[PDB]
Design an enzyme around this catalytic site. Structure first.
Site, PDB file in Angstrom:
ATOM      1  N   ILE A  33      34.779  35.659  38.682  1.00 59.42           N
ATOM      2  CA  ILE A  33      35.699  35.010  38.374  1.00 59.42           C
ATOM      3  C   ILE A  33      35.786  33.339  38.489  1.00 59.42           C
ATOM      4  CG2 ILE A  33      37.174  35.179  40.353  1.00 59.42           C
ATOM      5  CD1 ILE A  33      39.776  35.784  38.250  1.00 59.42           C
ATOM      6  N   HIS A 101      28.494  44.638  47.032  1.00 59.06           N
ATOM      7  CA  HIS A 101      28.288  43.931  45.810  1.00 59.06           C
ATOM      8  C   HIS A 101      27.053  43.114  45.915  1.00 59.06           C
ATOM      9  CE1 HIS A 101      31.355  41.391  47.398  1.00 59.06           C
ATOM     10  NE2 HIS A 101      30.760  40.433  46.901  1.00 59.06           N
TER      11      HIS A 101
HETATM   12  N1  LIG Z   1      39.288  39.733  40.168  1.00 62.95           N
HETATM   13  C1  LIG Z   1      37.883  39.406  40.199  1.00 62.95           C
HETATM   14  N2  LIG Z   1      36.912  39.305  39.145  1.00 62.95           N
HETATM   15  C2  LIG Z   1      35.797  38.906  39.370  1.00 62.95           C
HETATM   16  N3  LIG Z   1      35.229  38.438  40.471  1.00 62.95           N
HETATM   17  C3  LIG Z   1      36.197  38.352  41.733  1.00 62.95           C
HETATM   18  C4  LIG Z   1      37.383  38.790  41.606  1.00 62.95           C
HETATM   19  N4  LIG Z   1      37.944  38.695  42.637  1.00 62.95           N
HETATM   20  C5  LIG Z   1      36.981  38.156  43.433  1.00 62.95           C
HETATM   21  N5  LIG Z   1      35.828  38.065  42.653  1.00 62.95           N
HETATM   22  C6  LIG Z   1      34.671  37.207  43.201  1.00 62.95           C
HETATM   23  O1  LIG Z   1      33.862  38.189  44.160  1.00 62.95           O
HETATM   24  C7  LIG Z   1      33.370  37.504  45.265  1.00 62.95           C
HETATM   25  C8  LIG Z   1      33.764  37.798  46.452  1.00 62.95           C
HETATM   26  O2  LIG Z   1      33.058  37.112  47.492  1.00 62.95           O
HETATM   27  P1  LIG Z   1      32.078  37.566  48.534  1.00 62.95           P
HETATM   28  O3  LIG Z   1      32.349  38.891  49.287  1.00 62.95           O
HETATM   29  O4  LIG Z   1      31.539  36.534  49.700  1.00 62.95           O
HETATM   30  O5  LIG Z   1      30.815  37.983  47.573  1.00 62.95           O
HETATM   31  C9  LIG Z   1      33.517  36.109  44.921  1.00 62.95           C
HETATM   32  O6  LIG Z   1      32.437  35.479  44.222  1.00 62.95           O
HETATM   33  C10 LIG Z   1      34.552  36.041  43.938  1.00 62.95           C
HETATM   34  O7  LIG Z   1      34.789  34.873  43.214  1.00 62.95           O
END
Ligand SMILES: Nc1ncnc2c1ncn2[C@@H]1O[C@H](COP(=O)(O)O)[C@@H](O)[C@H]1O
Lengths: 115, 113
Positions: A33, A101
């Site tokens: 996102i 992830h």
């Molecule tokens: N609802 C969502 N849909 C897609 N990506 C997301 C969502 N919420 C968080 N993210 C992404 O998930 C990642 C979480 O951060 P990190 O744990 O450092 O990888 C970041 O790149 C966010 O932009």
């Protein structure tokens, strides 16, 4: 619950929207996102694992599958010039969602150091 | 294996600061560290880049990550770390032998390059 309590569990169960690239019985790939590159997507296991530091030995195949799905999706999305895969662990890694992830970023030159 | 400097390291032909080894992978400190702790985990099988890995390689690739997280713990990275795989020119891949970077001991920033 299948998928866990985080926002990613909600995505897995189709309770909140996502732009899905690939789905199988073990994982899900969807666009980030807040993209940090022209293409930026995530590959996540359907099994909840909070972070890489607590993954079990028997999670090896699943973790490898995330990478294989990541590289296949990258090819299908036309990232023919390359890409970077990233896992953020804990505070120093900048982790914000505690469901393991793999990021896949491409479509521009990535720089060094990787943050 | 293979015809890169990482093959030479696997074959013990040139030195490296080895952290861990088993029958299928090797972990060693990066020669150009970008964080107070920066090491690599590489398969002994010569896979040139992640884009050419096959389904049969899935558990081996996962093994790199498990070895990486175990080495990170052993090296005292209790505040976290970042794992990275670079592919091709846009990914900044420096050696055509698959390698998992593990970086920690400082705050890692965003974007990741
Ligand atoms: N609802 C969502 N849909 C897609 N990506 C997301 C969502 N919420 C968080 N993210 C992404 O998930 C990642 C979480 O951060 P990190 O744990 O450092 O990888 C970041 O790149 C966010 O932009």
């Amino acid at each position: 619950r299948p998928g866990g309590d985080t926002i990613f569990g909600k995505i897995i169960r189709k309770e909140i929207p996502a732009k899905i690239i690939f789905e199988d019985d073990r994982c899900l790939a969807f666009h980030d996102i807040s993209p940090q590159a022209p293409t930026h997507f995530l590959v996540i296991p359907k099994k909840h694992i909070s972070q890489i530091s607590v993954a079990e030995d028997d999670d090896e195949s699943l973790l490898g599958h995330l990478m294989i799905v990541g590289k296949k999706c990258a090819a299908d999305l036309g990232l023919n010039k390359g890409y970077r895969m990233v896992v953020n662990e804990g505070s120093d890694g900048g982790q914000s969602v505690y469901h393991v992830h793999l990021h896949v970023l491409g479509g521009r030159q990535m720089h060094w150091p990787p943050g």
